[PDB]
Design a protein around this ligand. Sequence first.
Ligand SMILES: [Hg+2]
Ligand SMILES: [Hg+2]
Ligand SMILES: [Hg+2]
Ligand SMILES: [Hg+2]
Lengths: 97, 99, 101, 101
Amino acid sequence: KYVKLNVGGALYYTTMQTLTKQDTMLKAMLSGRMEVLTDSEGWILIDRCGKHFGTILNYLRDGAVPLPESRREIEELLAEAKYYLVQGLVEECQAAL
Amino acid sequence: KYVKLNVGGALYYTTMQTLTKQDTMLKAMLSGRMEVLTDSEGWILIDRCGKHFGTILNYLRDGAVPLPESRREIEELLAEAKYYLVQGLVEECQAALQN
Amino acid sequence: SSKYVKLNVGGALYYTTMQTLTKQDTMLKAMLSGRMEVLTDSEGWILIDRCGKHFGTILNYLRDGAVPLPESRREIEELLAEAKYYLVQGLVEECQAALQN
Amino acid sequence: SSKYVKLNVGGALYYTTMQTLTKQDTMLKAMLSGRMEVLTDSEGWILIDRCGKHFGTILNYLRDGAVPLPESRREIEELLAEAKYYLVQGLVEECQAALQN
Ligand SMILES: [Hg+2]
Ligand SMILES: [Hg+2]
Ligand SMILES: [Hg+2]
Ligand SMILES: [Hg+2]
């Protein structure tokens, strides 16, 4: 089954399978182990920038993702990784630095 | 004739001729060789990022496509190419990564 | 009456929000504020007679307030035309500046 | 007026307006003036048996009256061929001029 998320105005479409693949905030969001905030149209709202959210979804899907080149973009990706509790990507970004 | 796909929230409108032109998983989706899940508006849902999907559609249509400059986007494309079993583009992306 | 927006830009399909399109003062904000005439189809897509090649970049500039410009002079010029058309004042300058390199 | 026209050019899908296609004297104007046969499908797409690589560039030249030209001579020749075919005389001249070494 598919889940649709509004992350800072950026719209995403993914599955329960992807968001529950790793131990993260998103799994906790969908396991019912945490409240999720939805609107009238059924979008899970997240008050974060959606710039790198697409990168997070890819990491969950493939278990790996190409990291950004510039150090600043690595920190941006890292910040989101820490927030969503994607420990694998957090470490991998810390390693890249 | 025309197919409309929701790829990771990115919406696309293409043709059957394009999606079935080469031997890939996308051909298999519409060759009836596979399950297709659509939403209320009739958009075929695909749980992949749609960033490079436009590039995938063009490769199937034209048999060739301009690759991105940075190594990062080529690798991103390679991941999508590998997933959809676009073997032709996979090779050129693997090849493009020379340095 | 929705905050979710779907736009047909020259045949290129985009799905975005009011939150992104109203971040800066541009033609797109006036278009969705009802402050301007809009042409929609049966399925609820606002039609826009411009190429959608660089439109994704326009949306990202509105979202993040900045975007990586293309390398070649040709594509910066392409973006400049789109930025100017949508009256994206921030992006117009940065691209006009980029051509003075 | 501002009615929408959609063309399938070699598999590339485009959305433009009557206003754009009738701005200049070209083959595309003749297509909508009924001065020439157009083949449409069940969904209302005007079919054109041409590669759609540069058609977006043709549409932009009609929209803005100008467009950034490609760098390489080969791509200028490609665009020039399409301009000649669609009878976009304005763009033909600028492409012929660009190939002046
Ligand atoms: Hg992505
Ligand atoms: Hg951001
Ligand atoms: Hg071509
Ligand atoms: Hg274009």
